[PDB]
Each structure stands twice: as structure tokens, then as C-alpha cells.
């Protein structure tokens, strides 16, 4: 005779629906992330791989439209771990290449104080 | 501005010389009367030791404020030690951000090694399967 | 008897000159900004954290210091008092 | 040094209009090199669906042959 046990095991149930659906949304967007700029991917373009990119946060952030809502969860720990494999020399190879990247501009700092 | 035995405002503040301590004179005098010690400390103490509150002797004093030039000095430091913790809040911040940033580019150029390969391989089986 | 802090400090009576602070904080302009931009920023942000803990901080001892002044005073007009009870003595006896 | 104390007013004042802007450099800084960091994780997570639609060109391709 369960009373209050159905019950107790459906919000259970209810809650490992929901642990699923989370992570396997997608892994980008649940782990952390701008206006809308289709004139930057013009300009970004005017190769292949950086409009794919663009095309990708434009549809996430949704003279902006919407559309691509169809691009699952196994498909992208297959993806995760096969990358994984290609990318002490590994450690140093991509020291260099973040302090190649952390190496106009001035006039963003100077507004961002405006809004402080 | 309170006596640390009784917890009252004391009337006639009577400052010892072995704990340093405020205490109102008709306290701390039935203390010694007891035993000769200080009450906080547990140390030797007479009346002759205990020292009544005074002016300080010539020169004239004003209360504390934030104009006086040591009051003035002393915030300085409070304005220039906050600030120090201020850059370890983004010092710290930063080594995670750019041992990230190291972790994410490295990923990235042993990923688009691979991407250069299929996009070789998927054509030249296009490549090869279209002309039999 | 001090260093070259007292060359410096009687120079600065006897000429009656008070040496000229950072006068540029108050001022500037828009349209080098990028690093006063910058300053003012931060600046802004200190005051702000600074202003929100004082106003609570201040909240709590505005008063608290107050009191404290009140401690200090009545200690001061008890030796006046003190004095006063001395010389009067002092005074009848010679009269006397 | 000897240097004149009125000076060392105005340099007192130069050293913290120097600080206030050696702090302020070294922030906004921080927050475009982690803007930076995110943009390279949407590509980085962008080329891993485009490598799949590639693995199935290469699918595609290997059942061709085999017929």
C-alpha cells in the first residue's frame, strides 16, 4: 500500500527526465556564451568555416531574423570524444598559441567607463 | 565612553597603568579595596597606580574628523588597500580565462587539422566514386 | 629637529604658498582619453562601492563617532571643575 | 631627494591619476580577452556539427564504392 510513494517517485522520475534533456540540449549553449551583425558576416566573408560559425550564433541569440532551429544527445559525445583525441609538447603548443591570440580599441575602453 | 566591569556610563572614568582599560573610579577603587589587582588582567594594582582622565596639558585638541591631516592619511591607505585586492580579483580571473583561452585555441588547431582532412576525404571519394 | 620634511614646511609658511594638487580629475573633455576614460571608470566604481559601505558603514557609526565626541567633552569641563575648586581654596586662604 | 615639497604634492597626484588608469587598462582588458574566449567556443563548438555532416558525405561516399 504506497501512499505518497507514486508520488514521490514521479517528481523522482520527472526530475531524471529533465537532468536529460538539459545536458544533452547542446554543449555549447549549456555551458556559457553580442548584436546581431549579418553585414559583419557579409564583411567577415568578402573561409567556408567562419560563416558556418556566424550563421550558428545568429541562430542561437534568437535586423535580426530567425530560422535554423534543426542542427542528438549521442551525435555529440561521439563529436566531443573524437576531438578530444585529435587535439608536455600538446601543453606548450597551445600556451604559445593563447598568447599569440591574447596579443580602435581604445575608444571601447573609454565608453565602457561611460556606462561605469 | 562605558566601564568594563559594570557596563554603565561611567561618572568619574579612571584610566590603570598594568591592563589598559577605562574604568569608573568608584568600581575599580572597591576592586583594589578587595584584592590589589586589576580586574581584566588579574595583574598587581594599587590606587596610587590608577590615573584619573585629563586634558592633555597645553597644547589644544579638536575631535576626530576627516579633515585633520592623520585622520586624512589613514583613509588614504583603507582607499589604496581596497584597490590592491581590486587587481587580485582580476589577476585571478585572468589566469583561469587565458589557461581557458590556451586549453580552447589548442583544441581548436588539433580540431581543424582533421576538418582540412574530411573535407579532403569526402570529395576525393566524390572525386573518385563519380568518374566509374 | 626633523628632516627635509621641515625645509619644505616652513618654506611653505614663510612664502604663504600651499603646493598645487592635481587639478585635471574635475576639468577634462571629450573628443590619452582612453586611459582617463578608463580612470574615471574605475574611480567611479570605487567611490560607488566605497559610497554604498559608507553609507551603511556611515549609517551604523554615523552616531556611534557622535557619541564618543560626548565622552571626550564632559572629561575636559570635570578638570575645569577640579581647577576651579583648587585656586578657589587657594584664593580664601590668602584672603583669610 | 632635496626636491621641493609643493613638487611632491602634485607628484602624489600624478601617482595615483597614474594608478586609477594602470588599474583601469588592466580590466578591460580582462573583459575582451573572455569576449574573445567566447567566440572561439561557438566556432569550436560550430566545426564539431559541421564535422558531422562531413562524416556523412564520407558514409555516403563508402557505401557508393562498395556497390
Given at each position: 500500500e504506497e501512499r505518497e510513494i507514486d508520488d514521490t517517485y514521479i517528481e523522482d522520475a520527472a526530475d531524471v527526465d529533465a537532468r536529460k534533456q538539459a545536458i544533452r540540449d547542446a554543449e555549447r549553449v549549456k555551458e556559457m556564451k553580442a548584436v546581431q551583425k549579418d553585414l559583419p558576416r557579409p564583411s567577415e566573408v568578402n573561409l567556408r568555416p567562419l560563416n558556418v560559425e556566424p550563421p550558428l550564433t545568429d541562430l542561437q541569440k534568437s535586423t535580426m531574423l530567425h530560422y535554423d532551429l534543426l542542427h542528438e544527445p549521442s551525435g555529440n559525445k561521439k563529436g566531443k570524444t573524437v576531438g578530444f583525441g585529435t587535439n608536455t609538447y600538446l601543453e606548450h603548443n597551445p600556451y604559445e598559441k593563447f598568447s599569440k591570440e591574447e596579443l580602435e580599441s581604445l575608444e571601447k575602453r573609454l565608453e565602457i567607463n561611460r556606462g561605469h | 565612553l562605558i566601564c568594563s566591569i559594570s557596563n554603565e556610563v561611567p561618572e568619574h572614568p579612571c584610566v590603570s597603568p598594568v591592563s589598559n582599560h577605562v574604568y569608573e573610579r568608584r568600581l575599580i577603587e572597591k576592586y583594589i579595596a578587595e584584592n590589589g589587582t586589576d580586574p581584566i588582567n588579574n595583574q598587581p594594582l594599587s590606587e596610587e597606580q590608577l590615573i584619573d582622565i585629563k586634558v592633555a596639558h597645553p597644547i589644544r585638541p579638536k575631535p576626530p574628523?576627516?579633515?585633520s591631516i592623520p585622520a586624512i592619511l589613514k583613509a588614504l591607505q583603507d582607499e589604496w588597500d581596497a584597490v590592491m585586492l581590486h587587481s587580485f580579483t582580476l589577476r585571478q580571473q585572468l589566469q583561469t580565462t587565458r589557461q581557458e583561452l590556451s586549453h580552447a585555441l589548442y583544441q581548436h588547431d588539433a580540431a581543424c587539422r582533421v576538418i582540412a582532412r574530411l573535407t579532403k576525404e569526402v570529395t576525393a571519394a566524390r572525386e573518385a566514386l563519380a568518374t566509374l | 629637529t626633523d628632516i627635509m620634511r621641515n625645509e619644505f614646511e616652513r618654506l611653505a609658511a614663510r612664502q604663504p604658498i600651499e603646493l598645487l594638487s592635481?587639478?585635471?580629475?574635475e576639468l577634462p573633455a571629450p573628443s590619452e582619453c582612453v586611459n582617463n576614460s578608463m580612470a574615471q571608470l574605475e574611480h567611479q566604481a570605487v567611490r560607488i562601492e566605497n559610497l554604498e559601505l559608507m553609507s551603511q558603514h556611515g549609517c551604523n557609526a554615523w552616531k556611534v563617532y557622535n557619541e564618543n565626541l560626548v565622552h571626550m567633552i564632559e572629561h575636559a569641563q570635570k578638570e575645569l571643575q577640579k581647577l576651579r575648586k583648587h585656586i578657589q581654596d587657594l584664593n580664601w586662604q590668602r584672603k583669610n
Amino acid at each position: 500500500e504506497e501512499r505518497e510513494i507514486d508520488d514521490t517517485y514521479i517528481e523522482d522520475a520527472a526530475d531524471v527526465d529533465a537532468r536529460k534533456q538539459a545536458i544533452r540540449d547542446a554543449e555549447r549553449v549549456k555551458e556559457m556564451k553580442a548584436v546581431q551583425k549579418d553585414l559583419p558576416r557579409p564583411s567577415e566573408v568578402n573561409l567556408r568555416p567562419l560563416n558556418v560559425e556566424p550563421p550558428l550564433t545568429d541562430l542561437q541569440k534568437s535586423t535580426m531574423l530567425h530560422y535554423d532551429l534543426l542542427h542528438e544527445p549521442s551525435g555529440n559525445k561521439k563529436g566531443k570524444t573524437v576531438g578530444f583525441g585529435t587535439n608536455t609538447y600538446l601543453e606548450h603548443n597551445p600556451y604559445e598559441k593563447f598568447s599569440k591570440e591574447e596579443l580602435e580599441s581604445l575608444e571601447k575602453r573609454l565608453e565602457i567607463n561611460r556606462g561605469h | 565612553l562605558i566601564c568594563s566591569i559594570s557596563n554603565e556610563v561611567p561618572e568619574h572614568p579612571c584610566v590603570s597603568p598594568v591592563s589598559n582599560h577605562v574604568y569608573e573610579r568608584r568600581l575599580i577603587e572597591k576592586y583594589i579595596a578587595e584584592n590589589g589587582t586589576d580586574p581584566i588582567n588579574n595583574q598587581p594594582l594599587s590606587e596610587e597606580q590608577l590615573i584619573d582622565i585629563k586634558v592633555a596639558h597645553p597644547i589644544r585638541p579638536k575631535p576626530p574628523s576627516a579633515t585633520s591631516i592623520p585622520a586624512i592619511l589613514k583613509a588614504l591607505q583603507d582607499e589604496w588597500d581596497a584597490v590592491m585586492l581590486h587587481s587580485f580579483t582580476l589577476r585571478q580571473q585572468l589566469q583561469t580565462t587565458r589557461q581557458e583561452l590556451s586549453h580552447a585555441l589548442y583544441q581548436h588547431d588539433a580540431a581543424c587539422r582533421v576538418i582540412a582532412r574530411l573535407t579532403k576525404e569526402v570529395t576525393a571519394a566524390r572525386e573518385a566514386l563519380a568518374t566509374l | 629637529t626633523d628632516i627635509m620634511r621641515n625645509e619644505f614646511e616652513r618654506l611653505a609658511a614663510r612664502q604663504p604658498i600651499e603646493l598645487l594638487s592635481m587639478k585635471r580629475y574635475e576639468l577634462p573633455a571629450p573628443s590619452e582619453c582612453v586611459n582617463n576614460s578608463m580612470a574615471q571608470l574605475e574611480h567611479q566604481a570605487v567611490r560607488i562601492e566605497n559610497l554604498e559601505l559608507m553609507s551603511q558603514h556611515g549609517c551604523n557609526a554615523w552616531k556611534v563617532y557622535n557619541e564618543n565626541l560626548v565622552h571626550m567633552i564632559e572629561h575636559a569641563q570635570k578638570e575645569l571643575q577640579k581647577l576651579r575648586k583648587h585656586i578657589q581654596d587657594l584664593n580664601w586662604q590668602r584672603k583669610n
